[PDB]
Please model this.
Amino acid sequence: QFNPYGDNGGTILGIAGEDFAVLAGDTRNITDYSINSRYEPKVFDCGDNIVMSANGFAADGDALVKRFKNSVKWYHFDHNDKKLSINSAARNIQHLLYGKRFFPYYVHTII
Amino acid sequence: GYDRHITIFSPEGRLYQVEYAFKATNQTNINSLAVRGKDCTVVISQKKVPDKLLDPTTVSYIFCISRTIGMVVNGPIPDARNAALRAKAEAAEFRYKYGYDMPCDVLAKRMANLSQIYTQRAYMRPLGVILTFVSVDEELGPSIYKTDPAGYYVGYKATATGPKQQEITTNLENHFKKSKIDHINEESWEKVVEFAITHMIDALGTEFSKNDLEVGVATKDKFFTLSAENIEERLVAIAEQ
Amino acid sequence: MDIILGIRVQDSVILASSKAVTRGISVLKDSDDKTRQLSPHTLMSFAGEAGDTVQFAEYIQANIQLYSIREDYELSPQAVSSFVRQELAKSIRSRRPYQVNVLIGGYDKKKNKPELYQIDYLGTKVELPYGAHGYSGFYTFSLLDHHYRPDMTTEEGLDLLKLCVQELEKRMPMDFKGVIVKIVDKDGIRQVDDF
Amino acid sequence: TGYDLSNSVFSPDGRNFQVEYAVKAVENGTTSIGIKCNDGVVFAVEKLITSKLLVPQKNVKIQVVDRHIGCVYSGLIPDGRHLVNRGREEAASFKKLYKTPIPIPAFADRLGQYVQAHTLYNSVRPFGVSTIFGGVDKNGAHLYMLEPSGSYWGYKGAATGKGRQSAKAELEKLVDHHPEGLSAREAVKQAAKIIYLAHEDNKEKDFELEISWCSLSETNGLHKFVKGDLLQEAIDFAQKEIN
Amino acid sequence: DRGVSTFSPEGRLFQVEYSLEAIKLGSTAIGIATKEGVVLGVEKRATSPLLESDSIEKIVEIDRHIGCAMSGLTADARSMIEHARTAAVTHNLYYDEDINVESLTQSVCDLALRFGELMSRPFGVALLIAGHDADDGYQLFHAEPSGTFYRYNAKAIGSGSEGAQAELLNEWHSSLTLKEAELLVLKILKQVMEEKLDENNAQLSCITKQDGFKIYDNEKTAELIKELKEKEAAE
Amino acid sequence: NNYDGDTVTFSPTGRLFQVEYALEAIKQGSVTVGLRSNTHAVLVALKRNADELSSYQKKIIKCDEHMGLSLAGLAPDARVLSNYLRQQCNYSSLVFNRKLAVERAGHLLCDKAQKNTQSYGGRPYGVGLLIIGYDKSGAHLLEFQPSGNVTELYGTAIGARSQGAKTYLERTLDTFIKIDGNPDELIKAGVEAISQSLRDESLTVDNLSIAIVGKDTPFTIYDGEAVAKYI
Amino acid sequence: MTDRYSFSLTTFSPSGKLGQIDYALTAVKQGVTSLGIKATNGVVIATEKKSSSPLAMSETLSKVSLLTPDIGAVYSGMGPDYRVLVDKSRKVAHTSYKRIYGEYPPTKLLVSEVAKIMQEATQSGGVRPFGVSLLIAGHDEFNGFSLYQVDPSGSYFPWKATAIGKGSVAAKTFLEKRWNDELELEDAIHIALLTLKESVEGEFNGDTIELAIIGDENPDLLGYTGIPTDKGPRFRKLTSQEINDRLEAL
Amino acid sequence: GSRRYDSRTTIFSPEGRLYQVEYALESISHAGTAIGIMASDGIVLAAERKVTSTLLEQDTSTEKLYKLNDKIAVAVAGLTADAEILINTARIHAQNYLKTYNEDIPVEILVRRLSDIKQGYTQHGGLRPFGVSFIYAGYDDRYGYQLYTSNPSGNYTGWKAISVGANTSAAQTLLQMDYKDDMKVDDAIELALKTLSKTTDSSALTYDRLEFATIRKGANDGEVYQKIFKPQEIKDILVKTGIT
Amino acid sequence: GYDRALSIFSPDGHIFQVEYALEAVKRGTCAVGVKGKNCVVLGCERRSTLKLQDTRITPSKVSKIDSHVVLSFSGLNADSRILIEKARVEAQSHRLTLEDPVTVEYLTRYVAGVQQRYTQSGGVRPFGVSTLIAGFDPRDDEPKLYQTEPSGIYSSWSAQTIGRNSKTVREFLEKNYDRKEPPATVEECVKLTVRSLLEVVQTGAKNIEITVVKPDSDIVALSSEEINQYVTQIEQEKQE
Ligand SMILES: [Cl-]
Model:
């Protein structure tokens, strides 16, 4: 039977300081015991000083980041180029994820 | 007077749109004729190519609906082709659903019922065409069935359609009074085509070259149209007698 | 949800329904009323799948109340029971059926007779002198076969009902935290506060 | 009366006045032509230069369908585009199911039935374009011309627009003087001349020439635009003939 | 007859232009924007003295930071308000923030032209949408049934609009206080109103960053009416 | 007269009156100018107000980082069409990772406007658009009309008294086309062009609206004190 | 596109007339005369075969149609409208009855279903009424023989005997004199031919007249043997020869 | 488009009337008169057939009086075809109610639903209204014997005695004159026939031009019987009252 | 589906279909609502051209929407049933989800919303009905009286009348009703309602219907004799 999920491995890490914040992630991409790429970035600048990473099943992770990046674009169009605050971005992402509550994005997201 | 714009009854119980669709029939100014032999059914029609720039091979009002059924149209070509495509689809579907080739008279009825719907339903206009279906049916033999915009249809011993239809009709009537039979008592289809052309010449009073005519022939298990050279060969035989 | 009983006597219908609401290894509540008044002289107790029970009971209640306002007239217990049965009969062949069993106790004012109907989640209706749903029946039916008489008073019916509850409290595995008893008669519906 | 107010209504003549009114919009448009040749077809069109501000070569009017069919039209330009969009869908579904690219006669009927369908109801307007189109298939070259009514025929030469009569007259001479046939490269040159001659009927604004062609030998059976040296060669040929 | 979405020879939609005539028949509504807040005021216009005037609801809350006044066929405004309230709350749910006054107005104006042969006709009501946000501060918008909205420093709509607008032209300046704006709405309302202005047949409201959108009591407005009369007699 | 009740009806001379009446709405609209060089493309738009107390109606809309338009006529119709363009530009990016060509943008608008002119019930769009953009084949300027007709140009203008600016650009064609690698000078030429359409009123700080896109310049709009440089 | 005519094309006028129904009846008046007579042991329905052309084969065009083995129909008015009604009438006999009860519907109920179809064309959106009046003759076990008329309005009436179309006024008067409750089937056929001769103008023979009966069961026309309960169709169309035999002793 | 040909059946006049409803009532006023009379021990339904022909089959005919269920019947005035559409709907509605509640449908509930259908055709859908007026005669255990009428507007009212169709003005005056509350069925039968006999447009009232029906409790003990009169039974009741 | 826009604007800014629906209300029998200190009374006219009526079974003019709210109307009778049905359903639906009966304002707002929806929906005409909705909110003793109309506007009234000759009875109420001191008792409120109808009705026999609504779902309809006593009392005081 067809299994729509997969595990692309890797790990990510976010730490916050007083006037800064970091979002790190390794560049390895894998399936089972094979290496797919030694350099495949999964931490992205999404605009409005928001960095994002969706680790787990890469296809779902890419789709999500792609959708959020697009969500930021339309936020500008619909609200007079207003800057999307990090707290607002978080809530927006909750709705993206929960929208597929019954066919989930198999990812651990950090912004 | 919006009762003259759509297909609803006028005070005197008439459908003017249906009546005006009949007048669109003669818009092309072409006369057709159909007759039956012993083994065949022949249909002939005038072919008028006024523009010199036209490709004369593509100018046709005769259609091959199925392998066995042929159809000639009197009316504008867009509506003619509309009817032709539908008839082809209907004949194909019939064969698939019921496991045998659609008879000429059954197809005629089906197209007539479709035409009837346009006379009752408002949003659809009638097609300004008269469809003459011909074949050699495996049960009923040589067959001629004709449909009009009113949704009327009937079988024919022979028939004619067009502006000078009445002259051709009486010409054929007078022949069948004389011969005392329902068909052209002739063995080969070649001579039945010669009969058809001869009697059209007498009725219309015009002479025909090879490019002035268009001929369709129905035999058992196939209907086919004649080329210019097939007609020319046929015209030579008439002249030499 | 577990224990619901019903006894029809001479001049009234008596419904007893357990107070316990259990989820997992915890009795979340011990004062639950497993009944809804459908009309002034019609009462429906219920038991079954969590959520479904109350959702169904209130849905029926709303429909009967809507009828009462529209016609300015109270539907007979027989009419209400038939309506309820049909809703369950529809339900059983739905995508997700109501898993609810009900007893409908009512007093018909036109006939001046009490009436008790037992309907299961399949839409299986029966009029009875006494009824029960779930495992309760396995004890109470044989008990009532013996002690029940058709001409009993409401007070005799309550003593007969006490006899059932005592037997259930003795032999049933689960603690159902006693019962709320309600009486349906010519004067309408009232609750017995000390049982 | 009032028979001309609604589409799909027969007049007492047996005519659909709304379709005839759509023809008036076609007659108002710029001149476009089609020339059938030995092993293919050639299309040409008049582009009126309304202003100096129009970018030359960058308002393309001739359209390709599939990879082997060319379409040009006169009248309401948007209506033409709508028809070509449909043509492309029809051609795609044909190739999808039957594998082979759509034959030109087959394609001609697909448009014909679609345009004819827009004369059947009062809820739609007839097409305000006459479309000249064609190409090369397994059976050789074909040229067609389709009208608002849904009427189409095969043509040796075709013309439509404001200078159709001038173009038709010039086309008739080519058919008479070349019974054995006209070559592809010749037809391109002739096409240019005929557009320039047909421009006499629209001579207030000066114009821009645009030519395309399908040929079994010259373009390998595919539709291509005539550009650069071959275009300028055709323009010069046309310039020499008017003087 | 003729199509609902038909253009006139001058290039205007017949139905939109006719709906504007209905709005001119409506009761007067005035809005004034300042740096201390935005004031909204309306003429109630009771058709009979037996009608309890406090039930006339022509000023309406959309969110805590956005208010709304109406004029014309006021029944048509109910579904517009419903949409605005949902839009405002929905945006807060999706983005954990207050929604921009302009974005709210745009959302309402998207309904306007969703009519034809969607609803059967345009709205017969104009709206004054007043609010505050962090980006563009205190704002006043005039939303029409044409789907168009203009931002205004001050604006009057309804039967006495052209007369009131000419008065607002002279009186408005960029340094108006909130109290000055309150009196100015009352002053101009009293001028254009048929019946004599009092606390029962006229209603005031405002929106401030601190306290949000508030409809004034009849007791509070009565004192502002009394304060207004005294100041005009004082010179 | 009898043939202007709806868009589905042709006149006896072959005219679509509802489409022509939609075209009339553009002529009533405020003037806007478009022009381009080889490196940049510029939109200049005269904004209109209801009165002194009102704001000035925004004429320019951004569609993507490399494309946008100015409007003249029914503003809500421009919002619908610009939103459609935003989606098509966006579809091209998500699916093909490809910036939408300005020419295809025009083709898509043409086909969307056309469908509204051939069907019963609907109506034509009542707005004209000037689309500018920079894609893989350099700078572009398009003129959209709600009849469906889209035209690529070096420069143009639409709205009331647009003939004055259109004549100026027709004279200045050879000059402004070669303003390469110089944004401010190309804008100056556009501001001088729109000035030929002014009557009684002059260009003020909250009246003028300018937008620009080019080789190393995303589509950006300038309003308020940012356009004081060009007065 | 799409059918935008979702509104009634038949409406009440100030005087209370339903114009389209009245005009449909006018179309029936113009139509060729047809009639029906009910006997004690059968029913007869008859009409003139108005030929459009002498080249046309009038045998192919059937004005009298079998609906069920025991029910037949004839009309006056517009032929195409009649043809499609017969198709719909045959189908509804199966879908709304035979596929449910395993037997053919009685005359009155089939008539009711046809009437329903004609009524809907009077009220439904974007359609005109049918331009025909039907005469439906039939037999069933519990009601015996019966004859019904159905009008464009959807109204139907049972008749002992009647006529519709061109010369219906004179034909009905003729039938009033000749009809009695003791008529045998052969007597009814004789009267039918007499009544029809008055309205017919040209040739009067088996080739220009179409006539069918609802009478005794016909085992020979059943097509199979072995089931005693199945005894054959009561509907029979009289041949051209069978008519001419009765025209000699006229 | 199609707007051109729309009659707009569901609109108001300047005076606030529904054109099509008013014209449908005008249509009904030419239909054969139908009378309903409610007595203490039953209900009478009498109706006049529309100009009968001598060759019309009278015994196996149904034009005016229709049975909805065992306890409820209706007299029709207007288009018969329209009435049959509504009758089949009413028959189905009665069976739905019985299926749901295991009780025969109360008369008013059936009448209201049928009247609500008519109302719908006057407010939406763009279709012509049903050109029909009903007289409902029925019994239930709540209100006992009941007479109602509904018309194309979808408005219904209850009556002791009522007429619909032609000459209702004259008919209602005669009923109002001779009707009284303590009336019996046999007396109501006589009143119904006498009223038709005077209001008829025919020369003389005969058995072949009438449809007649009663709803009595004349069955054996506490149950209702519907009697649709046969031709011979109408002939006898006409002689018995001295009309022929 | 039938789509036609029947309710549309005219050049002068009027929606004629809505205004013609008001004419239908003006044709309808008179209805009056008067609210006292602790009650509301709904009075209704019944035209006397209809004798041989059966008043047992004839639809009553005042309808119960819930046990605590009532609705009377003027205009097309058939139209009113549709609004009443919808209101009754919404009343039960509110109890089901909010676990509390509707307020009179909420019920009015709903009915008014329905009426408005029919003024800008395709294929439908406006309701030819204006309603008077009266009652008491749950656990509240303040009387409520609201009015709706075809356009969809609604408002609260101390006293109000609708229907034919309503301008006459409104004139009467405007001078006879004191805001500072409303009818203190049930008798006073009923009398003022009957008085106001007697300005228009004709005879005080079987032409006037009166329904009294009191707090906590206490609604009762007066009989002929009970109403006739008010008629007899008023006429004797009049002769002065
Ligand atoms: Cl068919």
The longest strand of chain G covers residues 132-140. The pocket of chloride ion is lined by residues B 110, 113 (CB under 6 Å). The radius of gyration of chain G is 19 Å.
